[PDB]
Amino acid sequence: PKYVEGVELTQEGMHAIFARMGYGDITSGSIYNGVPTIDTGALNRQGFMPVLTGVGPHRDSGHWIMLIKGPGNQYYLFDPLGKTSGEGYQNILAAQLPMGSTLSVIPNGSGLNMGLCGYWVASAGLRAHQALNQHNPPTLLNVGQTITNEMRNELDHDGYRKITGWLRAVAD
Amino acid sequence: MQIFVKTLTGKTITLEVEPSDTIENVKAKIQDKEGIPPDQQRLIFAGKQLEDGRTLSDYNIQKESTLHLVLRLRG
Numbered sequence: 001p002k003y004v005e006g007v008e009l010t011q012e013g014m015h016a017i018f019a020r021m022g023y024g025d026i027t028s029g030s031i032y033n034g035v036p037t038i039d040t041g042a043l044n045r046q047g048f049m050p051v052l053t054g055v056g057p058h059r060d061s062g063h064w065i066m067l068i069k070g071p072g073n074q075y076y077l078f079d080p081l082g083k084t085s086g087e088g089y090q091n092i093l094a095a096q097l098p099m100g101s102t103l104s105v106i107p108n109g110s111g112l113n114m115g116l117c118g119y120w121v122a123s124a125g126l127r128a129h130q131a132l133n134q135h136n137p138p139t140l141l142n143v144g145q146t147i148t149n150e151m152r153n154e155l156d157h158d159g160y161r162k163i164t165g166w167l168r169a170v171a172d
Numbered sequence: 173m174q175i176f177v178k179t180l181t182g183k184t185i186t187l188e189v190e191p192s193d194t195i196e197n198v199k200a201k202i203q204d205k206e207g208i209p210p211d212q213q214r215l216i217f218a219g220k221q222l223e224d225g226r227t228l229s230d231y232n233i234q235k236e237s238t239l240h241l242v243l244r245l246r247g
């Protein structure tokens with residue numbers, strides 16, 4: 001169905017869920033067949049961009065991540081699979097950004113994705129946009145550690161079923 | 173004639189088409205330019221999903237009309 005398959009957000013569904021949460025029309029990115037498509041203008045306006053990666057003519061199912069604009073020239077990459085996984089696409093995406101800018105991988109831990117990358121991108125993704133852009137920003141270590149904590153607090157006490165319940169609901 | 177195809181990633185791309193071209197032809201034209209198999213493409217004009225067998229003229233797609241492309245992809 002257009003928006004969610006099993007528990008995986010589609011390209012259509014990521015648009016939908018952002019619109020429902022009140023973010024207007026959000027533009028996403030992709031890396032399809034090793035080739036990125038990043039609309040730098042929209043990343044600027046919005047402050048962030050969910051990007052679907054590792055798809056192509058033979059792969060319908062890849063990984064969602066989040067590009068985040070910080071203040072000044074600085075940008076961030078949030079991969080729900082963790083820091084190491086996020087390093088994989090760091091160079092290719094940094095080469096897509098405006099001249100003179102930087103890209104840093106938010107250092108959250110691995111083993112917490114649990115098949116739910118798209119959901120994480122749409123919640124924790126945004127809370128990290130906020131944190132790195134606020135009045136007294138915490139450090140980039142603090143940000144990563146904080147996110148790791150949020151992911152595991154949210155899975156606690158049957159968190160997995162609750163999140164998947166919500167992805168199911170959103171499909172209707 | 174020239175039409176536009178816009179994606180949810182903000183790429184707009186131009187195509188050269190006949191009004192008698194089927195929607196499936198258009199997808200083949202997208203496969204050639206973008207490397208995306210027709211398999212992966214849902215196409216939409218004026219909130220209508222377009223059927224593979226019908227032509228562009230079946231939907232009144234003029235010169236300079238903008239179609240929307242959504243890909244059947246997930247993560």
Ligand SMILES: *NC[C@@H](*)CC(=O)OC
Pocket residue numbers: 008009061062063064113114115116117118246247
């Ligand atoms: N598309 C689901 C995202 C999670 C993931 O990337 O599994 C490895």
